[PDB]
Every structure is written in structure tokens, then in C-alpha cells.
Design a protein around this ligand. Sequence first.
Ligand SMILES: [Ca+2]
Ligand SMILES: [Ca+2]
Ligand SMILES: [Ca+2]
Ligand SMILES: [Ca+2]
Lengths: 259, 259
Amino acid sequence: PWEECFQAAVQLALRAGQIIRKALTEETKTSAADLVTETDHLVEDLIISELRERFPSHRFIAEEAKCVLTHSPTWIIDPIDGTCNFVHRFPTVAVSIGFAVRQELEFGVIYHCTEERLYTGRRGRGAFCNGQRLRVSGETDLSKALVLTEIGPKRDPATLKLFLSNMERLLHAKAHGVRVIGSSTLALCHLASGAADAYYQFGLHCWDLAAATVIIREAGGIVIDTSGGPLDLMACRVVAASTREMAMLIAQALQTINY
Amino acid sequence: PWEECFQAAVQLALRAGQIIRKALTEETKTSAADLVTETDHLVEDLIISELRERFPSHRFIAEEAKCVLTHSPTWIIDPIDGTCNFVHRFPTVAVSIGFAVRQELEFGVIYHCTEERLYTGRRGRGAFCNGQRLRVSGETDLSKALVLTEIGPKRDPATLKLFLSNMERLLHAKAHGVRVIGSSTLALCHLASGAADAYYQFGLHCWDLAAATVIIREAGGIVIDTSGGPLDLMACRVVAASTREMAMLIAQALQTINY
Ligand SMILES: [Ca+2]
Ligand SMILES: [Ca+2]
Ligand SMILES: [Ca+2]
Ligand SMILES: [Ca+2]
């Protein structure tokens, strides 16, 4: 699984990013809410069929069509990351399609519909954005860290107490700031470029960190589990920072909550 | 105080947005931190002197050079809103210059250096962004609301308990989501366009909501005090939403903390 798969993933991510950019020229409280899903369904189909059309033997995964990845060359996608922003015409929605082989990430392309920024990255060839070599921040002290993270959908009194208590711990240290742009993909992408030093989230999904990861890594950064050491994709949490140190750091300063 | 003042404010906001966009092509932990301030000082000077050059009798206010506004036609500016993001090369930093006469806001232009979006708005002529008529969301039920807000600099155990407890209340209702892009100006601008329904912040400053307000209002939205009714500019808090209802709503669901 090589390049004919990459040149495609990007070609489709581009179309799948345009058809969606033109969508935001909308006009309404709930009518839009549908336009979106209709779009989400329009994108997902586009990608998981044109890619099916070529390489008719590869597996797929996405928000609509469990996250069980076999050793087969499987394509992990999130047709539209940031449907809530999209509903409000908030300029930050992405379409990410990641590709794994032998049960490990080989590459991934994340697109920025509005800002037309295109993040890509293969393994053994580094990460780029609109053909410009990306390299992870390179920071290590939280006191000089800009953390990224998003709120989950689980609006349960249990959940929230932890999410907030968790923000606090990072703020309690001297982390410059916390950002909640409302998009996991772009957040991870920002980290990859260096616009962010760390990121974290529980209630996240496999199709979110599938592409970013490849990029964040070939960029230099590191992506692991809220605990430490390894990174469990079929789990629903992640911890990727600017350095191997920072990562461990944002860990021994974080409490767990998921599923 | 009319247009020769507006055509200028925009002309300078444009230059003052370019000289700053070219700045972000930087290369470092603290060297950048200076580049920024140097920039901030370079912008502020640009604007409060070219504007001084013309209309040598108007007053000024900005982050560097108390917030005491007389009835004189005073120019309220924030040469660079989002210096922390800028330090990290985070694509969301704005330069806002607002103009008040007879001690009330007449107009204001907020620029988006990276995304090249230009928000303007005079009083009695509505608000625009890159010549496209803007109109406030028009929402009223928090259950379908995308709230915007930023963390302050005051890293004091007192503060934080309130900030977080405050987020929670909005999340406890069924507000779609909360965003912390790291820029008051752009946040208020998003609200004005309709990409956001509400906004709130304590520890804010007069030069932040000076221009936005004009825009948010001529856009349709409403900007008031964390309490209600009136809006105290020389205070350090604000509450502007998509509708007069929403506003009151985000109020009777919010606790105060400032200075
Ligand atoms: Ca999605
Ligand atoms: Ca997602
Ligand atoms: Ca500033
Ligand atoms: Ca400011």
C-alpha cells in the first residue's frame, strides 16, 4: 500500500473539501443541521467508494460506515471533523482520511476546507502542509506551553466535573494557554506544525487521531496514551505533545475518564 | 468625526495587518516572544501617529500607550489582539482600532492578519467583512448555542475556580459548545457574522470590545454587562449574544469576578 493510495487520498480530500466549502454558503436553525449531515453523507460516500473503486480489497472505517482494524490495508476516515462548527458556519471544519497497513499507520491527509490548508504526512518521509515542511514545536516546559483540547458530547454531570478539573491542572501549572477550536483534527495538525505544543482528549475516536498521528510523528512530535508509553488507537483518548518529555509531563498531571 | 477617519483606520489596519502577517514567518523559545512585542510596538506606533498626523487633536488609548475616555473624539486601539497565539505562530491574531465620539462608539475595524478577513462597521450603516453584509445569528435558546470566551491572564486560585464553575453552567444547560480561540476581537467578530451565538469574558479590556461592539450591534446582536441592561466600557467584562433574549439568558446563568 503506497502512493496510488496517497495521490488518491489527497485528490479526494481536496474535492471532499471543496464540495464542503461551497456548502457553507448557506442560508435556518435546523435546516442547516441537515445540510451538514447531507454533506457528511455526501463526502463519506465520495471517499469510501472512489477509494473502493480503486483497490476494491482495502477495508474502511468512518463516523457513519465499530472501530476494529485488521491487518488488512484499512482506510480510517472522518468525512467531516467539526460538524458542530459547520452547523454554525464556523470557519474550522476538516476532512481527514488516514491509511494504515499491517495494522499500523502509513500515512494521512487532513484538510482545512475554509483556510485551504492541506496537512499530509507519510511514514519515513515526514509531514507537510501545502508543500511546506512541518516540524513539531520542540518545547518541553508546560510553563511555556499552549495546550489544545476539545469538549466531548457526553453532557453528563459525572463527565464534566472531570473535564473541568482536568483543564485546571494544566492551568494550575504555568501553561500559557488552552484552546478549544472545536476540531480534534486541526488541533492535532496545529500541534504538528508548531502552532501548539500539546493536545489531549477523552471521548475521542480512532478516525480522529488516525491521520494526525502519522503527521504529528513525521513532524517530530509524539503521540501516546493518557497513561503513558503506548498509544491505544481502539481506545478513545490521546496525548500528543511537542516533545517526549512534554508528553509524559501532561500525563503525570491528568486524570482519566472515557466510554 | 466621519470617514476620513474611517478610510484611514482601515488603511492602517491593513498595513498594520500585513507587517504583522510577514512577521509570522519567524524562526527560538523567547526570541519570538520579543519579535512579537517589537511588532506590537511597531504596529501601535504606526497607527497612533499616522492617525495623530491627521486629526492632530483626537485622543488615543491602547495596550501600551489608564482607559479614561473623554467626550473628545477618542481612538480606542489594540495594536495586536492575541499576542500569545502570535508567539506560537497560531493563525489567529487581530489588530483592532475603534473610534468613539461624544463618548460613544461611532465605528470600528478589526482585522484578521492570517485569514485576511476584514471586519468593519459604522453606526447607522451596519457591519461588513470583506464587503459582505454581516448579520447576527438570530438564535435565542442556549440549547442551540455555540458560546465563545477566553481565559484571562490572572492565574490565581481564586480566579480559576470561578472561570471553570462558570464554563460549567453554560455547559450544564444544553449549549452546543464552547470555544477558546485565544482572541477576544475575532471571537466578538465571529459572533457578529453569525459563526457564534454568544460571548463572555471577565478581565477583558476597553480596547478589546470597543470596535467589535459597533460591529456586533450594526450586525444585529446585542452587547451588555455581565449583570444586564447597560454596558460599562471602563469596566472589564462583557456579554454580547445573538439576541437580546440570549444575552439576558447567558446572564441569569453567570457569576461575577474581575479586577
Ligand atoms: Ca466527523
Ligand atoms: Ca470527529
Ligand atoms: Ca493586544
Ligand atoms: Ca487584547
